[PDB]
């Protein structure tokens, strides 16, 4: 009722500036967010859960209740899912495989992910994938796909090749292509002599990894740059330019992670440049706090900036929105909830923007009006629209979702 | 009525989280925003209006309609003010003096600002002040208060001392202390051999500058650090530590400017630290875009963080909120309008935060709850309260204010 | 003799670590540095010299004696050149053409550069070139090649196409391909609604611009990204990713400018990545001080890192090294001299590095030894080798060159 | 002989510029470097060596041969020391205490460091100290001195109070005041509501901590700011402005750590500013690679700028020079060796600078000459001077020191 009313006023407000709230809602329904599985168990995986997170990535917090297997994970995920409106996907790491016996990374098969697949069907989720190139003895030296050792190198190439197959299976089975992201930790902590060679090896390996042609309808390859990681601060083989080059040249999708750049550097600006040259873009929304810290996505300037770009450019088909963060210092379900909802809220507000009007003002050099209007947009009643969206999707419109979280914690997590 | 309706709903939603919108509105009225006069004529001043803006500060845009004198300036200020709700002050620079004949800077008098004073009275505005230590032949070497030349030095000293008197005069007349900010461009463009001497001169100069005791009820001294300027990139005499030591040791107020720090550096963090050692703070809100660009303040992450800090700590008395930006690329009046409204919006929002609750959660280590709630606060109907605030002050609640600016521009600005 | 002695000692020291100083000297002779002409007259050019430097690029200092025509510029250049050992090139801007009557930018011709060419021949200098897309009426809106106006856009397109021909002309005549760099200021000061369209337009334009096939032996196209400029802080059409994609996909050269990235971002790291995708690199060495301030190049960490990368990779052929800075606050000749020699000193040091050994240690995981060695390199007697370099090229080995500059200043610059 | 010869040449060259190399050598011996003990055992300490390094501080590498006790530590220190020329000191942490039985941190005594002292006596070293406020159950919440719980708070206060007594004990016994630095990890990983209260508590605590007047001839109190740490990214109680204010207000010494600031921020600039307010400076030399990474100090731009400042200002008495870094990815002895020598190399180069002349050029506005000379200074034969310094101190002049380290590694480290 209050919502209802609030909704009506909003409807009218927006109408007056040429904005159709309904349509906005429809459109928001066309923008799924792929939730990252790893937020649930601290990137532990099911290969060897308790066995140090590596790659220059880190888990800070030790809050209790982490999931410890597929089952807990799925349960945790559903809980989160019920408190997040609209479309979602699940982004999986190869270490999240389910097998009675241990599987060599270079040997995974679709079969190791059937449960995930059946579950996804049941939950009306699309699935995404990622070879796991870290937290492994063969990753110990800080090199994987660029490793100078042929054999090591081969093992990683093989794992990647296999991963493409699982991914393709996901798309076959789900009817929506699985975006399979390649991220590797390869780099050097200190002053490096030869930055080239590794880059050369990485180039060759990737080409081999994507050599097998797969159905685009079921599978997409993406490469993700990174500036630096803890323990590999001075050099990253797979740098921004390297992958920009790579994706452009081999026509794979390019993954842009909001926490993987320089200080003050923003992927929102990159979206429009990159799409002129690469087929698709996988966007990893994450909050870096003075480093690639992986904090939870907030409804902030850059998250909003990113949404705007996607929406202004009508990137519904070519962009894949994913979360990329891991905060172990708080409730993990809450983490996914806050994150996802935030992304959606940024999206919605972008959908509520009178872009054409603004675009038109800009074209005319009416900078005064553009700024002004861009700013006014912030005090328009979008919240009302967001809450109607929640309501429609049977999701708590406000802070009440916290009680559910609290409740599940008490009831479940508390026992883990 | 829609407003009224929206207001009522909000009133209720907030109340449900323990927030009283009516009190909020009242509190907002206790937070004036000191608008910088220099935004109206591109820091031209009236001494010698057309005569290059110096000091490492720039004016970009050349948009038409700039004020050309006190009269235009006041008119322009008036338009702006009618479009901005609640309390405001006028922050004046010494070069805005009004004299039939030329006045040496080191000789200005209270009488050179009587009109400004009268006007202020009439408009119920408090006045703040600043000595002008740039765009002057004796500032051309890039040194003023720290100039090795005793005589040049003296001159600036004197100008400063005289400015304290003008400021005190304002306080006396207006019944509200004038905060007199001291900013100098002093620094070097390139690799510097001696960073010490200039700082030594600066320190001594300052002490001299403030040696005359004035009524604290009418006048406050503030000092403003700065990281770098165009043309003085390598070193700034009046650095952050410099003024922090100064203000702490001499007990003056400290001026913190949102555009005068390192990349990713934020004054919002600094507020709670500095208030433990300095009597008062002068806050310069500004948006630096890649440098001390002086862009209009937006309702953004930092402007909000700033507001929150002031409000959380109940800094009503010890904080002086001011704007410090200059964008000549768009309508000047709009520039002021957007920025002032934005500051006020941020403050309002801070006033609507359930801090005590939050504070309590944080103290108990409930970081899940704190984050979640901080975030949910962004989808609370604050805009309705803001709009009511506008209404109550007879100010447009939405974008309509542009029309006004537009019309003033046609009728007025168009003829300049 | 002292030099001789020091040299001999050095010769032996280096020999002992497997380094041949003689060979390094020879190598150094294979690495010209392209001097930027614009440092001589404050990017004034000869179209309309006194007529505001625009493009978000600035000239700070106002030191006296700037060159006022091609004659003075050449004289100044020669003086500089006699103080810089080894190979050099001259990098010209379109606005430095020499014509009795005005020439529309869109109609320049080889013939407008004949004297530069004859001079170059006589001075044994290769020539480089650049279209001048700024400081012009049709660049006044901040857009050139991405301008939405078809005709303006065409104009800049034409001007670039015409510049290619001048460029080829240089390569024909001099027998060394002229690298023709493309840099445009296009961007926005403030928050932008559409970053895509301008990139789209830029993309198409460049394509048209390079459509004419010219002889590689005489001509090379290069594109240069930029992060931001004064008066275009928020967005730059031709971003890093933009050109990275561009160069990669159209196989043009990619220009990496040391002052054009984010804080802490270094192109030295980008060299080995870009060369895997682009056929050539044009490197602009510059010292950005908190902004693309264009300070003189120092023998500093980053200039050395760039040097090392080129040398380590044996990029003698694919890399074009040039200067890109402008300091008008000191003697301009000295500016050139300092920067040029510094780049050469950085090169020589790189050439005196026992790379193989190091490379070898790194590949074995001997990071201890690597770090140790790299650092000890710094206290080896490279100064001696540099000084002998100077001597063999009949150039002052030390600070004495300043006398020369001072002398020219007195005799010539003093009367400008 | 070759050294002697190079030495003589250098001698002459520097004299020609008014620099006396013998005097330099002498002044260099007046500038000890305080080696941090913790690099040798990865901050393990002796309370509970194997028991996770906390505080937002990390140890990356796991290279073998870390010291396991005081004995190992001392032996390792000695090996390092024989490879580092001229004066050094040892900086101790409270966790390196030697006791048969466990000692609550709140009750340590001078007697728990007796061996250290006797060893220092025998090795002619001065000693520095630090309370350890991390890697402890009572520091698990991320708060220590700012902890809201009175008792926890009380424990850390007492620990600091007792550490002061140990420190004074060092001063007494050694005849040189021990500088006792106070660093705590206290901060928040995420968005914080109340930054004020912890600061107020910290303030009050520090005042209590230093309430006991000790003999300045034996002891000095220093406070160390920090910007952020892993797991405490968002807020740090003891910020730059907090400690600048504190040190200025209580007249303690101020610790500036080169890895503890914002990107591009440098302490070299801060020295001259701070010195005007605080009695003494504690300077931590460290290399932050994209974060407070704690990499080994290189002879780099900033290390050199710090040295230059100390020396230019004749800060021999008021500044205490120490190392603050921890790299566990390479041989720990070498880490110390590299960093220490690098710091000494930078100081020596500063000592060889013709400051007065340069100062004099600068004061006259001869910026051309200043830059030119500053830069020419880099090609002067400082290496020979350094190498003589090494020889006079019975230390390897070059890279040969690695063989000693390698040898120790084989004989001793290999068996740990
Ligand atoms: C676990 C995850 O794939 C990882 O974070 C990568 O995506 C990359 O962002 C690393 O910093
Ligand atoms: C004109 C005005 O005082 C000025 O901008 C200062 O406050 C400081 O920001 C200067 O760069
Ligand atoms: C004038 C000169 O070409 C210019 O500097 C561009 O190349 C680019 O560096 C912009 O600053
Ligand atoms: C362990 C050591 O004291 C520590 O490094 C502190 O001094 C501070 O620099 C934190 O990073
Ligand atoms: Mn990440
Ligand atoms: Mn400013
Ligand atoms: Mn530049
Ligand atoms: Mn540190
Ligand atoms: Zn990612
Ligand atoms: Zn300011
Ligand atoms: Zn350039
Ligand atoms: Zn430190």
Q: Is C257 in the pocket of ligand 3 (CB under 6 A)?
A: yes
Bridge partners (DSSP) listed for residue D220: D179
Instruction: Quote the CA–CA distance of D160 and D180 in Å, as a whole number.
Output: 9
CA D48 remoteness from chain centre? 24
**Ramachandran angles phi, psi of A93, nearest 5°:** -100, 150
Instruction: Quote the CA–CA distance of A220 and A178 in Å, as a whole number.
Output: 6
3-state SS of chain B is CHHHHHHHHHHHHHHCCCCCHHHHHHHHCCCCEEEEHHHCCCCCCCCCCCCCCCCCCCCCCCCCCCCCCHHHHHHHHHHHHHCCCCCEEEEEEHHHCCCCCCCCHHHCCHHHHHHHHHHHHHHCCEEEEECCCCCCHHHCCCCCCCCCCHHHHHHHHHHHHHHHHHHHHHHHHHCCCEEEEECCCCEECCCCCCCHHHHHHHHHHHHHHHCCCCCCCCEEEEEECCCCECCECCEECCCHHHHHHHHHHHCCEEEEECCCCCCCCCHHHHHHHHCCCCCCEEEEECECCCCCCCECCCCCHHHHHHHHHHHHCCCCCCEEEEECCCCCCCCHHHHHHHHHHHHHHHHHHHHCCCHHHHHHHHCCCCHHHHHHHHHHHCCCCHHHHHHHHHHHCCCCCCCCHHHHHHHHHHHCHHHC
Q: What is the DSSP letter of A21?
A: H
Element (H, E) at D306: helix D301-312
Give the residue on A whose Cα is nearest the Cα of C246: A277
- Asked whether the beta carbons of C312 and C284 are under 8 A apart, the reply is no
Nearest-CA distance A22 → chain B (Å): 18
Mutate to test the interface with C, among A241, A356, A368 (most CBs of C within 10 A): A241
To the query of whether residue D226 is one of the catalytic residues in this protein, the response is: yes
User: Are A372 and B399 a contacting pair at CB < 8 A?
Assistant: yes
Which tokens in the block code for residue D367?
């910026």
User: Are D359 and B194 a contacting pair at CB < 8 A?
Assistant: yes
Q: What is the DSSP letter of C107?
A: G
Could you tell me the distance, in angstroms and rounded to a whole number, from the CA of residue B261 to the centre of ligand 8?
Answer: 21
Neighbours of ion ligand 7 (CB under 5 A): C 259, 292
Give the residue on C whose Cα is nearest the Cα of A350: C193
User: What is chain D's Cα-based Rg?
Assistant: 21
Bridge partners (DSSP) listed for residue B282: B255, B320
All chains having 3 or more CB pairs closer than 8 angstroms to chain A: B, C, D
Instruction: Quote the CA–CA distance of C324 and C335 in Å, as a whole number.
Output: 11
Nearest partner of C114 among C131, C133, C101, C127, judged by Cα? C127
Instruction: Quote the CA–CA distance of A384 and A2 in Å, as a whole number.
Output: 10
Nearest-CA distance B50 → chain A (Å): 24
Ligand 3 pocket mutation, candidates C91, C131, C183, C286, criterion most atoms within 8 A of CB: C183
Integer distance in angstroms from the first to the last C-alpha of chain B? Answer: 40
Nearest partner of C3 among C413, C416, C400, C406, judged by Cα? C400
Which tokens in the block code for residue A330?
């708080």
Could you tell me the distance, in angstroms and rounded to a whole number, from the CA of residue A223 to the centre of ligand 9?
Answer: 10
Which tokens in the block code for residue A282?
């996988």
Who among A189, A230, A289 is closest to D233 (CB)? A289
- Asked whether the beta carbons of B288 and B321 are under 8 A apart, the reply is no
Residues in chain A: 416
C-alpha to C-alpha distances, C318 to C321, C323, C340, nearest whole angstrom:
10, 17, 20
- Asked whether the beta carbons of A31 and A85 are under 8 A apart, the reply is no
User: Are D291 and A290 a contacting pair at CB < 8 A?
Assistant: yes
Cβ count within 10 A of residue C148 = 14
Contacts for B93 with CB less than 8 Å, ≥ 6 apart: B37, B38, B43, B45, B129, B130, B132
Exactly one of A260, A270, A344, A345 is catalytic; name it.
A260
Ligand 2 pocket mutation, candidates B324, B325, B326, B339, criterion most atoms within 8 A of CB: B324
Element (H, E) at A167: helix A150-174
Instruction: Quote the CA–CA distance of C136 and C147 in Å, as a whole number.
Output: 14
Q: State yes or no: B292 annotated in a binding site.
A: yes
Instruction: Quote the CA–CA distance of C227 and C235 in Å, as a whole number.
Output: 8
Give the residue on B whose Cα is nearest the Cα of A376: B399
Who among C199, C244, C263 is closest to A244 (CB)? C244
Report yes or no: A36 at the C interface, CB cutoff 8 Å: no
- Asked whether the beta carbons of B200 and B153 are under 8 A apart, the reply is no
Q: State yes or no: D112 annotated in a binding site.
A: no
Instruction: Quote the CA–CA distance of B164 and B178 in Å, as a whole number.
Output: 9
Cβ count within 10 A of residue C283 = 28
Nearest-CA distance D181 → chain C (Å): 29
Break chain C down into helix, strand, coil percent, rounded to 5. 45, 10, 40
Which tokens in the block code for residue C189?
């000061």
- Asked whether the beta carbons of A17 and A369 are under 8 A apart, the reply is no
Which tokens in the block code for residue A193?
């002599």
User: What is chain C's Cα-based Rg?
Assistant: 21
User: Which ligand has its closest atom nearest to the C-alpha of A132?
Assistant: 1
Nearest-CA distance D384 → chain C (Å): 8
Which tokens in the block code for residue C125?
């200098």
Q: Give one DSSP letter per residue of A36-78, joined into a string.
A: EGGGTTTT--SSSSSS---SS-------S----SHHHHHHHHH
Contacts for D175 with CB less than 8 Å, ≥ 6 apart: none
- Asked whether the beta carbons of C303 and C346 are under 8 A apart, the reply is yes
Nearest partner of C286 among C306, C271, C314, judged by Cα? C306
All chains having 3 or more CB pairs closer than 8 angstroms to chain C: A, B, D
| Strand, helix or coil for residue C281 | strand
Taking each continuous run of H as one helix and of E as one strand, the counts in chain A are 14, 10
Could you tell me the distance, in angstroms and rounded to a whole number, from the CA of residue B262 to the centre of ligand 2?
Answer: 16
Give the residue on C whose Cα is nearest the Cα of B63: C141
Q: Where are the beta strands (DSSP E) in C64-194?
A: 88-93, 126-130, 178-182, 187-188
**Ligand 4: residue whose CA is nearest its atom 10:** D57
To the query of whether residue D257 is one of the catalytic residues in this protein, the response is: yes
- Asked whether the beta carbons of D79 and D410 are under 8 A apart, the reply is no
Cβ count within 10 A of residue D118 = 11
Bridge partners (DSSP) listed for residue A63: none
**Ligand 2: residue whose CA is nearest its atom 3:** B183
Instruction: Quote the CA–CA distance of B128 and B117 in Å, as a whole number.
Output: 11
Report yes or no: B295 at the C interface, CB cutoff 8 Å: yes
Q: What is the DSSP letter of D394?
A: T
Mutate to test the interface with D, among A59, A263, A293, A330 (most CBs of D within 10 A): A293
User: What is chain A's Cα-based Rg?
Assistant: 21
Pair type for strands D187-188 and D281-285 = unpaired
Report yes or no: B16 at the D interface, CB cutoff 8 Å: no
Sign of CA dihedral C53, C57, C58, C59: negative
- Asked whether the beta carbons of D33 and D343 are under 8 A apart, the reply is yes
User: Are B381 and A379 a contacting pair at CB < 8 A?
Assistant: no
Could you tell me the distance, in angstroms and rounded to a whole number, from the CA of residue D324 to the centre of ligand 12?
Answer: 5
Q: Is A223 in the pocket of ligand 1 (CB under 6 A)?
A: no
User: What is chain B's Cα-based Rg?
Assistant: 21
Instruction: Quote the CA–CA distance of D38 and D66 in Å, as a whole number.
Output: 10
The label of the residue with tokens 């002068």 reads B282
Experimental approach: X-ray
Instruction: Quote the CA–CA distance of A47 and B380 in Å, as a whole number.
Output: 43
Instruction: Quote the CA–CA distance of A202 and A220 in Å, as a whole number.
Output: 19
Q: State yes or no: D225 annotated in a binding site.
A: yes
Which tokens in the block code for residue D179?
């500088």
Q: Is D128 in the pocket of ligand 4 (CB under 6 A)?
A: no
Q: Using CA atoms in the order B9, B13, B15, B17, what is the torsion angle rounded to 10 degrees?
A: -170
Instruction: Quote the CA–CA distance of B124 and B142 in Å, as a whole number.
Output: 38
Pair type for strands A235-236 and A187-188 = antiparallel
Half-sphere exposure of B196 (CA within 13 A, CB side): 17
Contacts for C16 with CB less than 8 Å, ≥ 6 apart: none
Q: Where are the beta strands (DSSP E) in C4-82?
A: 33-36
Ligand 3 pocket mutation, candidates C38, C40, C53, C55, criterion most atoms within 8 A of CB: C55
Instruction: Quote the CA–CA distance of C196 and C242 in Å, as a whole number.
Output: 11
Nearest partner of B249 among D273, C319, C93, judged by Cα? D273
The label of the residue with tokens 């006991």 reads D212
Cβ count within 10 A of residue D62 = 11
Any idea what the Cα angle at residue D132 is, between residues D126 and D133, rounded to 5°? Answer: 150
The label of the residue with tokens 């408190």 reads A83
CA B243 remoteness from chain centre? 17
Instruction: Quote the CA–CA distance of B114 and B118 in Å, as a whole number.
Output: 6
Element (H, E) at A221: strand A219-224
Report yes or no: B53 at the C interface, CB cutoff 8 Å: no
Which tokens in the block code for residue B258?
């949102």
Q: Which residues of D152-177 are buried (b: 16+ CB within 10 A; e: fewer)?
A: bbebbbbbbbbbbbbbbbbbbbbebb
CA D212 remoteness from chain centre? 25
Instruction: Quote the CA–CA distance of D215 and C137 in Å, as a whole number.
Output: 72
- Asked whether the beta carbons of B162 and B106 are under 8 A apart, the reply is yes
Who among D9, D331, D376 is closest to C368 (CB)? D331
Sign of CA dihedral B140, B143, B144, B150: negative
Contacts for B176 with CB less than 8 Å, ≥ 6 apart: B89, B126, B127
Q: State yes or no: C284 annotated in a binding site.
A: yes
Report yes or no: D141 at the B interface, CB cutoff 8 Å: yes
Instruction: Quote the CA–CA distance of D295 and D289 in Å, as a whole number.
Output: 7
Instruction: Quote the CA–CA distance of A222 and B356 in Å, as a whole number.
Output: 46
Which tokens in the block code for residue C37?
């002409």
Instruction: Quote the CA–CA distance of C94 and C132 in Å, as a whole number.
Output: 5
Instruction: Quote the CA–CA distance of C183 and C161 in Å, as a whole number.
Output: 14
Instruction: Quote the CA–CA distance of B162 and A335 in Å, as a whole number.
Output: 57
Sign of CA dihedral D402, D404, D406, D412: negative
Which tokens in the block code for residue D303?
């290390």
Which tokens in the block code for residue D388?
């003589």
- Asked whether the beta carbons of A174 and A217 are under 8 A apart, the reply is no
Cβ count within 10 A of residue C357 = 16
- Asked whether the beta carbons of A117 and A127 are under 8 A apart, the reply is yes
Q: Is D415 exposed, middle or buried (CB count within 10 Å of its CB: 0-12, 13-18, 19+)? A: exposed
User: Are A379 and B398 a contacting pair at CB < 8 A?
Assistant: yes
Nearest partner of D192 among A295, C13, A196, judged by Cα? A295
To the query of whether residue D66 is one of the catalytic residues in this protein, the response is: no
Q: Using CA atoms in the order D330, D334, D340, D342, what is the torsion angle rounded to 10 degrees?
A: -80
Cβ count within 10 A of residue B175 = 11
Instruction: Quote the CA–CA distance of D268 and B234 in Å, as a whole number.
Output: 12
Sign of CA dihedral B49, B52, B54, B59: positive
Instruction: Quote the CA–CA distance of C304 and C311 in Å, as a whole number.
Output: 11
Instruction: Quote the CA–CA distance of C138 and C160 in Å, as a whole number.
Output: 14
**Ramachandran angles phi, psi of C257, nearest 5°:** -105, 115
Bridge partners (DSSP) listed for residue C283: C256, C321
Q: State yes or no: D226 annotated in a binding site.
A: yes
Nearest partner of A42 among A31, A30, A51, A32, judged by Cα? A51
Could you tell me the distance, in angstroms and rounded to a whole number, from the CA of residue B395 to the centre of ligand 8?
Answer: 52
The label of the residue with tokens 């990368």 reads C309
To the query of whether residue C207 is one of the catalytic residues in this protein, the response is: no
Sign of CA dihedral A180, A186, A187, A192: negative
Instruction: Quote the CA–CA distance of B51 and B137 in Å, as a whole number.
Output: 11
Long-range contacts of D98-104 (CB under 8 A, 24+ apart): D98/D46, D98/D70, D102/D47, D103/D47
Contacts for A124 with CB less than 8 Å, ≥ 6 apart: none
Give the residue on A whose Cα is nearest the Cα of B288: A264
- Asked whether the beta carbons of C135 and C144 are under 8 A apart, the reply is no
Instruction: Quote the CA–CA distance of A414 and B258 in Å, as a whole number.
Output: 44
To the query of whether residue C150 is one of the catalytic residues in this protein, the response is: no
Which tokens in the block code for residue B109?
């008098």
Could you tell me the distance, in angstroms and rounded to a whole number, from the CA of residue A329 to the centre of ligand 5?
Answer: 16
Domain boundaries, chain C: 1-416
Contacts for B292 with CB less than 8 Å, ≥ 6 apart: B56, B57, B226, B227, B228, B229, B259, B260, B286
- Asked whether the beta carbons of C257 and C226 are under 8 A apart, the reply is yes
Q: Where are the beta strands (DSSP E) in C250-386?
A: 253-257, 281-285, 319-323
Q: Give one DSSP letter per residue of D17-85, joined into a string.
A: TT--HHHHHHHHTT--EEEEGGGGTTT--SSSSSS---SS-------S----SHHHHHHHHHHHHTTS-
- A1-416: what fold? TIM Barrel (3.20.20)
| Strand, helix or coil for residue C220 | strand
Q: Is A154 exposed, middle or buried (CB count within 10 Å of its CB: 0-12, 13-18, 19+)? A: middle
| Strand, helix or coil for residue C45 | coil
Q: Give one DSSP letter per residue of C175-214, joined into a string.
A: TSPEEEEE----EESS--S-SHHHHHHHHHHHHHHHTS--
- Asked whether the beta carbons of C217 and C162 are under 8 A apart, the reply is no
Report yes or no: C54 at the A interface, CB cutoff 8 Å: no
Cβ count within 10 A of residue C18 = 10
Q: Is A345 in the pocket of ligand 1 (CB under 6 A)?
A: no
């Amino acid at each position: 009722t209050q919502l209802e009313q609030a909704w009506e006023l909003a409807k009218q407000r927006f109408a007056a500036v040429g904005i159709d709230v309904e349509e906005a809602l429809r459109q928001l329904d066309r923008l799924p967010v792929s939730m990252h599985c790893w937020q649930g168990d601290d990137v532990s995986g099911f290969e060897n859960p308790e066995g140090s997170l590596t790659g220059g990535i880190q888990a800070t917090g030790n809050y209790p209740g982490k999931a410890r297997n597929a089952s807990e994970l799925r349960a945790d995920l559903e809980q989160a899912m019920r408190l997040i409106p609209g479309p979602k996907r699940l982004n999986l790491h190869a270490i999240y495989l389910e097998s009675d016996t241990p599987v060599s990374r270079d040997q995974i098969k679709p079969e190791h992910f059937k449960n995930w697949v059946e579950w996804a069907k049941a939950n009306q989720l699309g699935l995404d994938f990622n070879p796991s190139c870290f937290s492994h003895p063969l990753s110990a030296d800080g090199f994987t796909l660029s490793h100078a050792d042929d054999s090591i190198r081969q093992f990683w190439i093989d794992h990647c090749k296999a991963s493409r197959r699982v991914s393709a299976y996901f798309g076959e089975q789900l009817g929506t292509p699985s975006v399979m992201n390649i991220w590797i930790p390869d780099g050097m902590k200190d002053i490096t002599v030869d930055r080239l060679a590794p880059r050369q090896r990485l180039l060759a390996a990737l080409d081999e990894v994507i050599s097998e042609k797969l159905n685009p309808a079921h599978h997409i390859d993406a490469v993700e740059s990174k500036l630096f990681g803890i323990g590999a601060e001075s050099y990253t083989v797979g740098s921004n330019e390297f992958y920009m080059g790579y994706a452009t040249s081999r026509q794979t999708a390019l993954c842009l992670d909001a926490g993987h750049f320089h200080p003050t550097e923003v992927i929102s600006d990159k979206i429009s440049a990159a799409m002129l040259y690469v087929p698709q873009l996988l966007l990893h929304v994450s909050r870096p706090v003075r480093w690639d810290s992986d904090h939870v996505v907030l409804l902030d300037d850059e998250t909003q900036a990113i949404a705007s770009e996607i929406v202004r450019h009508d990137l519904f088909d070519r962009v894949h929105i994913g979360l990329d963060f891991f905060d172990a210092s708080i409730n993990r379900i809450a983490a996914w909830v806050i994150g996802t909802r935030n992304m959606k809220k940024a999206l919605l507000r972008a959908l509520l923007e009178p872009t054409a009007e603004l675009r038109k003002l800009e074209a005319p050099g009416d900078y005064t009006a553009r700024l002004a209007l861009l700013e006014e947009q912030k005090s328009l009643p979008w919240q009302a629209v967001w809450e109607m969206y929640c309501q429609r999707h049977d999701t708590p419109a406000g802070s009440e979702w916290l009680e559910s979280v609290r409740a599940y914690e008490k009831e479940i997590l508390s026992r883990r």
